[PDB]
Design a protein around this ligand. Structure first.
Ligand SMILES: [Zn+2]
Ligand SMILES: [Zn+2]
Ligand SMILES: [Zn+2]
Ligand SMILES: [Zn+2]
Lengths: 214, 214, 214, 214
């Protein structure tokens, strides 16, 4: 596919909607704030909308390499603060995916350029859970790192001043840590769901523990 | 819709694909690098995939508030460098949308919190094109700012060291500046398409000029 | 000078203080919060302490290339928020200097690498005041840009959510825009001193106006 | 001291130099690139120039809260890249200090606002060396964290793409990890000096080991 094909398909798509689904934009037209914030990877192997069946306008979205929530990344923090304080989303979903190019590159450590600096945050995670990973079969270590990465980002987001203050003033906002694979497009709940400061700490340890078993 | 509904729909969606479109993941399974990098707004009113008809895996995606390409935002720059130097995408599309909450908030200047700092980059653009905007009917100024914002981000991306070096070594990478509205989902080419350092400067002025007329 | 010379001189310096100025650390030992926040250039041609005669512990300091206050730079914003809200400094000084390597590089635009992205913020300023600069003798344009840069950073800092909220709750914090040259080490007040939202806007225009004359 | 006193003292200081040290700016006037890059804390309890006896113009300087080198902080990375690739400094010194307000705040975890996000990078370090710290007397844990922080930042800087590429092309650049206290102003070499990729890894482990003993 080339550029002209995208513009042409869009023009035809727009016209076809009139006599196939005229109310397609009805929801959009009506100022309806999203209830979910989705933080995913730029790889976007399978669109979040397709994975969940959500309609356009129901989710606010941020995507970066390897779906990271770095303590000091204002790009991501700005999306979160806007979503939590202004749009007042009720659920935040951090979703990783098996076979993520970013996660793999962080382990193999090839010389890719500027992106290597961003990826060092993942290597920090790999070092952190070294013992845990060496306790499992080799073929499952990369997929496990993918899950650990999501859990650590959920933990990071929960500790941001944004989430801490929201939960402190009693706002209802839940964080979820999910992952999916390209073999079946099945969402997998890493079970680190946090609804407040206490469950954040509890479920985090819970998630890590469920891996010690696995 | 609640969380349980998303997980349940996903499980059912995955199963249905087997006897409706078994080869859905065939493309994904095959390591196929995306040809397009899409930089859009976190609002994601209408998914890029739906707007263009692109299949999953064909595009690399980054989304932030008001689709900005700040000179010094490493989150966005990391996505671009990875896409250009590693995935070697051939087209980069920066797409804004009319009625963007970020653009509007930058003009009205309400006290929203941390996000206000991110939005000041848009106010800089508004000041920059003050004369141009005052030369057009009031009802069209916000939509025009939305277009100007996209053009300025295309300009910013083109001047990053990442794009400058890519074009310098003769790599084929094109940047496009688009915008769409919720009234019809029709993509609008702002005609600032840049294929090298020269066309970047030329098309930028061209885009601004086409507005002086409009 | 080499590394061993610095360590050796430090050891001797420390000893000499006992029988030359025994109370040197008395001030430091006593938890005394700084009253001034100094934001300067990494070039640090002449130390701020030497320029003003301030004693150690009296100033909090941040230095980056070309003393910039980018709307979205969390490094600088973190220093400011800490200084204003926690240390409660009463004066913030942004000081540039004539002949700054960063300012010059932004104009000449040589290919220096990663730093070029940081410097684009200065080129934005150069474009912004194009008419003003072309209205003055060529030999004075670079020095004028150096002053304009400081004024714009003062403006940027004043518009951050940090300063806006501080002034809003009635906190006493003043921002100053200074510059000095290596020909005499003489501080030059650009007269853009802001004590609140109103004076920020007024003095900014004032500073620009005094240049139209110059 | 107030603002008028700083401006007045500067004016008098400048004049006095003529008949006390007329050649004070001679060095500065002569375009002499610094040989050292100093990365320190914004606290700046004792100026680097006073600690080492270096003259103005001999050092390039960056200061932020708790002297951090975050993998993805473009402010700090820009200073380093400019210093290494353009100024070609030969030594980079990361210097922390005992009693650092940033380090302490990271441990006590008070609610300070935006700065708490920046400080989470230090808490990550505290968690990382939990076992090591619990193996030492309580009264020495905070000072030890101060040293561990410096060692980790040296490690971070060494792993940046900037340092990796410099050492790869055979450039001579050495990184040092120091710390000083307000009780005597005595510099303490943490002995993690790295001159290349190999010594970076070796000296890092060495530094941590010397603590296991201490
Ligand atoms: Zn991925
Ligand atoms: Zn938007
Ligand atoms: Zn400078
Ligand atoms: Zn400190």
């Amino acid at each position: 596919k080339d550029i002209d094909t995208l513009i042409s398909n869009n023009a035809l798509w727009s016209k076809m909607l009139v006599e196939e689904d005229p109310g397609f934009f009805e929801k959009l037209a009506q100022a309806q704030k999203p209830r979910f914030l989705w933080i995913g990877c730029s790889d976007s192997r399978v669109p979040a909308e397709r994975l969940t069946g959500l309609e356009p306008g129901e989710l606010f979205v941020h995507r970066n390499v390897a779906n990271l929530v770095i303590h000091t990344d204002l790009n991501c923090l700005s999306v979160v603060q806007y979503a939590v304080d202004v749009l007042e989303v009720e659920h935040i979903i951090i979703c990783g995916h098996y076979g993520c190019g970013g996660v793999q590159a962080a382990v193999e450590n090839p010389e890719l350029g500027l992106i290597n600096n961003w990826l060092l945050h993942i290597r920090d995670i790999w070092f952190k859970h070294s013992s845990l990973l060496g306790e499992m079969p080799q073929e499952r270590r990369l997929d496990t790192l993918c899950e650990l990465n999501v859990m650590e980002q959920v933990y990071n987001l929960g500790h941001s001043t944004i989430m801490q203050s929201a939960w402190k003033r009693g706002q209802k906002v839940t964080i979820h840590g999910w992952a999916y694979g390209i073999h079946d497009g099945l969402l997998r709940d890493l079970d680190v769901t946090a609804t407040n400061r206490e469950t954040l700490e509890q479920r985090y340890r819970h998630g890590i523990s469920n891996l010690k078993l696995k």
